[PDB]
Write a protein that binds this ligand. Structure first.
Ligand SMILES: COc1ccc(C#N)cc1-c1ccnc(Nc2ccc(N3CCOCC3)c(OC)c2)c1
Length: 282
């Protein structure tokens, strides 16, 4: 576990190149290891006695649970010191995924939809990542297109442990309403989220996206489980979506049995799929 008080200043070690996006309670940069030139992603967060133990918790998980092919690797943590009583900046440093997010991948594909074969490759990788986290009793809580990232070799990596606002990817049991007073996250909630991003990949957007976040939030527990509207998709894919999106979380498959669903396991043309992906990156 990491001591915030023991973190060095990032000066001369890493440097920021350009803004890349946003994360939970911080901005995200394409960064660079100054001495070697190697690229890295750097999440920068203001830090306060308030935010610290949540910040500290995000760091510890990235450091502890990123030794796995499908989780963006921890590089380090730094504190850019700054006169009291003011905010210091914390730099959380991880491997750089040059291809960007799956959400970016969708935006630059024809029709904002992806081949089922691509979706299956990506879903397996996320699931595999989730399994590793769930094994260590970690819930991701923020599984969505933007948090699913790709390296220039089309390897899939999960990022942003800051939650471990936007309602669209939230499972029914997570939404505190009249019938569910003490809404809490469990591992299965990640699996609902995965089903939503699968739809996101196939259709460019999550269900209920045309509606206001507050009305989406209200509808998700009541409405029946979302489905693919086109039926051009295989019955293995539609069945996979129905497995992820079981409303009653207790009746929803565990991660390990979802890993054994045919859509996930029955993948020929696999190193072929990544090659296409790798090529589609440029
Ligand atoms: C959204 O990403 C994150 C969110 C939260 C946290 C945390 N904690 C970490 C990351 C992260 C982690 C590793 N690599 C990247 N790289 C990367 C991400 C996005 C892009 N974009 C930029 C513009 O739109 C097109 C592509 C990109 O361009 C080359 C590179 C990002």
């Amino acid at each position: 576990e990491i001591d915030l008080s023991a973190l060095r200043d990032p000066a001369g070690i890493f440097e920021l190149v350009e803004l890349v996006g946003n994360g939970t309670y911080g901005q995200v940069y394409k960064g660079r290891h100054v001495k070697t030139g190697q690229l890295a992603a750097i999440k920068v967060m203001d830090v306060t006695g308030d935010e610290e133990e949540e910040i500290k918790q995000e760091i510890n998980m990235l450091k502890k649970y990123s030794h796995h092919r499908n989780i963006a690797t921890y590089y380090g943590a730094f504190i850019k010191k700054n006169p009291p009583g003011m905010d210091d900046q914390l730099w959380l440093v991880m491997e750089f995924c040059g291809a960007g997010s799956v959400t970016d991948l969708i935006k630059n594909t024809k029709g904002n939809t992806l081949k089922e074969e691509w979706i299956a490759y990506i879903c397996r990788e996320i699931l595999r990542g989730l399994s590793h986290l769930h094994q260590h009793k970690v819930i991701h809580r923020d599984i969505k297109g933007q948090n699913v990232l790709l390296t220039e070799n089309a390897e899939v990596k999960l990022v942003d442990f800051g939650v471990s606002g936007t309602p669209y990817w939230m499972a029914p049991e997570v939404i505190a309403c009249d019938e569910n007073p003490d809404a809490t996250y469990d591992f299965k909630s990640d699996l609902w989220s995965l089903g939503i991003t699968a739809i996101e990949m196939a259709e460019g957007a999550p269900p209920l996206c045309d509606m206001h976040p507050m009305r989406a939030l209200f509808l998700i527990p009541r409405n029946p489980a979302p489905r693919l509207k086109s039926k051009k998709w295989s019955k293995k894919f539609q069945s996979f979506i129905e497995s992820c999106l079981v409303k009653n979380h207790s009746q929803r498959p565990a991660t390990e049995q979802l890993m054994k669903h045919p859509f996930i396991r029955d993948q020929p043309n696999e190193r072929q799929v990544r090659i296409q992906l790798k090529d589609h990156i440029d």
